[PDB]
Design a protein around this ligand. Structure first.
Ligand SMILES: [Zn+2]
Ligand SMILES: [Zn+2]
Ligand SMILES: [Zn+2]
Length: 925
């Protein structure tokens, strides 16, 4: 059962207004109850195969061959939105013949039946045309087209022209009866093109001027030569020509009497009766330079083709190469790929369950493009400041069984109004998924009654076909019921976070109760593993979506549910850790999409604690979003925002105040619950192994946290206490995160033993050495890396001169693991970790002491570290001095220039910053 909806989109418009109309339909489905029409209720209980839109009428083709039509009127436009006709009447079918295809022209409605008969119905006439002389003949031009001796299959209809095709590779075309005067030389009857032989034509799509035929592995076009190729023809039109235009929703034929020299202007055409207007030459095609032969489009070899639709801009195609999907726009001037675009989401989620649901919908020249993916949902397309596809914002819509749109022209416009003349009318037959809509409407009672009814039905009749059909239910962006519940559970306001800072509807609660009800459901137990281990269009599980969307109690509930389910299904291989990591953070995942890393880098945006001020920050630039000249963004914007974009850091940074909300939707303006965030960090530290995996910049979590702390200490001291809200405190989470992570013998071990043999850094040249000579592999495997460890030690000691607690935390963890005579192998492991850390501390201390003249705070911190670990620091300092004194005694010292010492401490820090804050050599691409 499906429901019918009407969308009015005035022309000319952008994709943003169309997306706003689709969104308005989406919340009218979601939060505005339900509404329909009396005469369309009979259409709701059947599978509508095809919907077409005429000038003032709409036609529906069903599965059983019944065709119905209705009238409508659209008043408002732009500087229910439609009025429907009172009664619906059907096609007279006393002969009992079912119908296969329908199509809409301006003056007639076309039908193709199973017996190969073409039927024509006038819009003005209330009864379909039947010839009295020939009872077996029904189309008035069937004799002229010569289709009476061949069974007919494929139809394509548009505003003025129609193109039709048999089984015998015979294609014909004609124009509407309102242009019968110029219909002597623009058309052709059924030929047999030898160039199209070899493969059956699988689809035909007609534009307003030309038409296209898609075969099994080729594309051909024929018809009117486009306006871009008229430059070479005039590389200048004499008077006396006869032309036609389709402007303002009406087709008209005129005659020229001026001489034309420049073709970029507008010309005045004398009107011709069907038995004197100023028209632009871009919408005028001279008839009395026509591509009467099919021309092959250039496509790459071994590429499957999915959906073809044509318009004035060219040929729009979806191409599949291997396991990848491109979107292509072909220009008819050269026949090559004019525009090539890659989808910003995953291709696997775009392919969906079935590849036959991918389609492209358009209505004419200026009409927009609606793309339908493999799941039957709408993929919203928009253009960024560059020439790519913007990141899509999901509409939360059910899949569409049938979609059809057309161009309508408004009637009797006043002369003193700026209302646009033309619009597009879109008709949707959206499916209903009742528990999906119950989840999206935030109602606990309907979900509870549905689960109780399903449990009673399984207990009584033992039927699970409806349940296994409901498991495969999807929303937009490849989202299941759990994904929809998580997306509903996102925080919206900052009221609780605003009120907790002092002296220091019911949608959310119903959503949480719904999540608990589906988590503790008895009947949903054998499918919750497949529900939780599913990836959406961004490649995230519901736990990853709850972490990234700042829904922390939802992530806590999902984590307990995964821990409960995973312990009862070990049995065979693919064991407990494999099931748990499949549910939490699966393999083949980007390192910047880890739940621990994302949980660490979700901080409050800097406009929330700085208004229109001009404090000193770090300034990032996006090429994609348009933050180019004076528009800027804070560092948390570069972390959470702009993750797949072309975002860079500018060295010449003046003062700015995060102009990120002006150009895009900043995802960091709202802070979630702090206690649930710390509890999630506590649970993720002691249950997974996500802390030993670096991010896409090759940084450990400890290095990222200490760099965030060292940046925020400098940035947050210029906060003055009293369009988005700017009355919140600066974020304090990274200090507590460092204090918790440093109390762990996995993170400290992986940080200190970084760059060793059993630790791979993706941005190091020594990581990928398997294709080299064996001697070079020996020379590269002799050494070990200590760049990032030295950077971490320098950032902990020199750049963190506002706290001491992290150093005592690290020293306490080291001493506690050194005094552990309980588990085997712990003591020597802690000894080696202590040796590596003391080597790094000794190197930093030596550099700082050489740079200073004849105590500073970092030297005091190094002395405290040496005093807390005396019997090993003495030996490592002996080794450091021995290494320093070797080249003097052997007389092989490298000559250097003299330098002056440092009287103050800021210049020594400036000189040691350039020595330790470096990067290893990247591998060869
Ligand atoms: Zn951006
Ligand atoms: Zn920001
Ligand atoms: Zn931002």
């Amino acid at each position: 059962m499906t429901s019918i909806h009407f969308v009015v989109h005035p022309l000319p418009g952008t994709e943003d207004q169309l997306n706003d109309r689709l969104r308005e339909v989406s919340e009218k489905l979601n939060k505005y109850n339900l509404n329909s029409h009396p005469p369309l209720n009979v259409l709701e209980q059947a599978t509508i195969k095809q919907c077409v839109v005429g000038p003032n009428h709409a036609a529906f083709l069903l599965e059983d061959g019944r065709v119905c039509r209705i009238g409508f009127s659209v008043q408002p436009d732009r500087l229910s939105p439609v009025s429907l006709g009172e009664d619906l009447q059907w096609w007279p079918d006393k002969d009992g013949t079912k119908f296969i295809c329908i199509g809409a022209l301006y003056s007639e409605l076309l039908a193709v039946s199973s017996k190969g008969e073409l039927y024509q119905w006038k819009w003005s006439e209330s009864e379909p045309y039947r010839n009295a002389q020939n009872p077996s003949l029904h189309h008035p031009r069937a004799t002229f087209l010569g289709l009476t001796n061949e069974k007919i299959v494929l139809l394509s209809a548009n505003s003025i022209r129609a193109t039709v095709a048999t089984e015998n590779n015979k294609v014909a075309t004609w124009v509407d009866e309102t242009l019968s005067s110029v219909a002597s030389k623009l058309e052709h009857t059924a030929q047999t093109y030898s160039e199209l032989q070899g493969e059956r034509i699988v689809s035909l799509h007609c534009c307003a001027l030309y038409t296209c035929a898609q075969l099994e592995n080729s594309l051909y076009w024929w018809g009117v030569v486009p306006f871009s190729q008229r430059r070479k023809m005039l590389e200048l039109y004499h008077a006396g020509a006869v032309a036609f235009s389709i402007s303002a929703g009406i087709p008209k034929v005129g005659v020229l009497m001026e001489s034309v020299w420049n073709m970029n202007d507008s010309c005045r055409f004398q009107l011709r009766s069907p038995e004197e207007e100023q028209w632009s030459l871009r919408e005028v095609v001279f008839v009395e330079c026509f591509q009467r032969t099919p021309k092959k489009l250039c496509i790459p070899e071994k590429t499957e083709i999915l959906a073809v639709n044509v318009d004035s801009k060219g040929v729009h195609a979806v191409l599949k190469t291997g396991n990848w999907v491109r979107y292509c726009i072909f220009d008819l001037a050269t026949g090559k790929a004019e525009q090539e675009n890659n989808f910003p989401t995953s291709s696997i989620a775009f392919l969906g369950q079935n590849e036959r649901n991918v389609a492209i919908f358009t209505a004419g020249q200026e009409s927009p493009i609606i793309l339908r993916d493999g799941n039957g949902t709408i993929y919203p397309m928009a253009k960024d400041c560059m020439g790519g596809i913007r990141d899509p914002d999901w509409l939360d819509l059910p899949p569409i069984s049938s979609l059809g749109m057309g161009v309508h022209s408004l009637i009797n416009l006043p002369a003193n109004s700026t209302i646009k003349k033309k619009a597009a009318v879109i008709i949707m037959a959206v499916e209903k998924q009742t528990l999906m809509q119950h989840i999206l409407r935030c109602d606990y009672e309907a979900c509870r009654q549905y689960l109780m009814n399903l449990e009673q039905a399984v207990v009584l009749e033992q039927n699970l076909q409806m349940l296994q059909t409901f498991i495969s239910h999807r929303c937009d962006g490849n989202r299941n019921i759990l994904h929809a519940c998580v997306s509903v559970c996102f925080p919206t306001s900052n009221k609780e976070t605003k009120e907790e800072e002092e002296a220091e509807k019911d949608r959310k609660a119903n959503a949480h109760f719904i999540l608990k009800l589906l988590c503790d459901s008895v009947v949903l137990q054998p499918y919750l593993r497949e529900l939780l281990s599913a990836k959406d269009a961004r490649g995230m599980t519901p736990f990853m979506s709850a972490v990234s969307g700042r829904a922390y109690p939802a992530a806590i509930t999902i984590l307990e549910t995964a821990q409960k389910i995973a312990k009862a299904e070990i049995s065979s291989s693919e064991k407990e850790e494999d099931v748990f990591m499949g549910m939490v953070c699966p393999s083949g995942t980007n390192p910047d999409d880890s739940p621990l890393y994302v949980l660490c880098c979700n901080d409050t945006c800097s406009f929330t604690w700085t208004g229109a001020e001009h404090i000193n920050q770090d300034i990032f630039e996006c090429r994609t979003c348009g933050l180019l000249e004076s528009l800027c963004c804070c560092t948390e914007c570069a972390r959470v925002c702009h993750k797949g974009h072309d975002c860079k850091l500018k060295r010449t940074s003046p003062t700015a105040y995060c102009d990120c909300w002006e150009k895009c939707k900043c995802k960091t303006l709202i802070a979630g619950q702090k206690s649930a965030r710390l509890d999630l960090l506590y649970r993720l530290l002691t249950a997974t192994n996500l802390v030993t995996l670096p991010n896409s910049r090759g940084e450990h979590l400890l290095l990222f946290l200490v760099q965030t702390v060292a940046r925020q200490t400098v940035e947050h001291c210029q906060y003055r206490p009293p369009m988005p809200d700017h009355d919140l405190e600066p974020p304090r989470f990274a200090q507590l995160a460092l204090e918790r992570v440093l109390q762990d013998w996995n993170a400290l071990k992986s940080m200190i033993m970084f760059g060793s043999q059993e630790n791979k850094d993706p941005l190091s040249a020594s990581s990928r050495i398997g294709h080299l000579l064996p001697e070079e592999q020996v020379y590269l495997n002799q050494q070990s890396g200590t760049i990032r460890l030295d950077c971490f030690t320098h950032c902990l000691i020199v750049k963190c001169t506002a706290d001491i607690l992290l150093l005592d935390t690290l020293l306490g963890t080291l001493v506690k693991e050194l005094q552990n005579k309980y588990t085997p192998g712990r003591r020597e492991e802690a000894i080696a970790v202590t040796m590596r850390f003391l080597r790094s501390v000794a190197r930093v201390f030596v550099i700082l002491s050489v740079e200073m003249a004849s105590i500073p705070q970092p030297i005091g911190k190094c002395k405290r570290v040496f005093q807390a670990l005396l019997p090993y620091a003495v030996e490592e300092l002996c080794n450091v001095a021995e290494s320093l004194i070797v080249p003097v005694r052997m007389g092989i010292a490298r000559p250097t220039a003299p330098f002056t010492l440092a009287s103050t401490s800021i210049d020594a820090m400036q000189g040691s910053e350039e020595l330790f804050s470096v990067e290893p050599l990247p591998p060869r691409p």
